[PDB]
Amino acid sequence: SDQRFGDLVFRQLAPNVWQHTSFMDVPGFGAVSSNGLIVKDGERVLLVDTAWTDDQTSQILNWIKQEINLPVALAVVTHAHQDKMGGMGALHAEAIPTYANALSNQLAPQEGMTAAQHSLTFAANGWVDPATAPNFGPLRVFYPGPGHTSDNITVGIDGTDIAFGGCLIKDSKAKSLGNLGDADTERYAASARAFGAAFPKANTIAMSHSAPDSRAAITHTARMADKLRLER
């Protein structure tokens, strides 16, 4: 099912939903992959994350024009890390409206990243403000709280069984919580469970550093963060 296109891999998770995977050689971590989503919303395309680099992101757009042949109406990025906003200049070069958490845009220059042109705000219940996320269609953006970072957001797709956890959620067989450098060890547990409650009917949990998994990935991440909470 994994379709190869250039330096990336593409997999169809559902009708109108695809997963794009880019690879990067972290020096002390081997060849680490990162996943994003491509959503066909009627006559337009919605992108849920970029690749590691500008070059890999332009390969994503070339795949969209090749396979779907529809304009990319908007692009959301889940937090300010290389695997998520590394291809921001590639999306801005094609005049694609980019959206991110307001904190992610404040943090992007601190890590050498191009901030998104629009900033998302959120209500007290973690859901995105409709004034900041216009015409998102099926995209349901949810802020579960500080976890993997302090700005990580999640996205769900209506009409589908799919909810995207980004780097907050790891697969049910993960032996660790991944990159904990920018993590909130206290709220990670409650944030992982908040993401599971925001999308209760989503049994296909997609994430950045793992293949799509069931909802056991949510509880396994929460239990892992439960022990991380008491170790700090």
Q: Which residues bind Zn ion (CB under 5 A)?
A: 81, 83, 167, 208
**Does 92 show up as a binding residue in the annotation?**
no
The DSSP string of 59-108 is HHHHHHHHHT---EEEEE--SSSHHHHTTHHHHHHTT--EEEEHHHHHHG
Instruction: For Zn ion, give the closer residue by CB, 73 or 163.
Output: 163
**Does 83 show up as a binding residue in the annotation?**
yes
Instruction: For Zn ion, give the closer residue by CB, 74 or 207.
Output: 207
- Nearest approach, Cβ of residue 78 and Zn ion (Å): 8
- Nearest approach, Cβ of residue 137 and Zn ion (Å): 25
Instruction: For Zn ion, give the closer residue by CB, 16 or 210.
Output: 210
CB 169 within 8 A of CB 217: yes
Instruction: For Zn ion, give the closer residue by CB, 33 or 160.
Output: 33
**Does 79 show up as a binding residue in the annotation?**
yes
- Nearest approach, Cβ of residue 15 and Zn ion (Å): 27
CB 20 within 8 A of CB 35: yes
- Nearest approach, Cβ of residue 134 and Zn ion (Å): 26
- Nearest approach, Cβ of residue 50 and Zn ion (Å): 12
Instruction: For Zn ion, give the closer residue by CB, 65 or 82.
Output: 82
**Does 20 show up as a binding residue in the annotation?**
no
CB 83 within 8 A of CB 131: no
Residue 134 CB-half CA count within 13 A = 5
Annotated binding site for Zn(2+): 79, 81, 83, 148, 167, 209
Summarize the annotated binding site as residue ranges.
79, 81, 83, 148, 167, 209
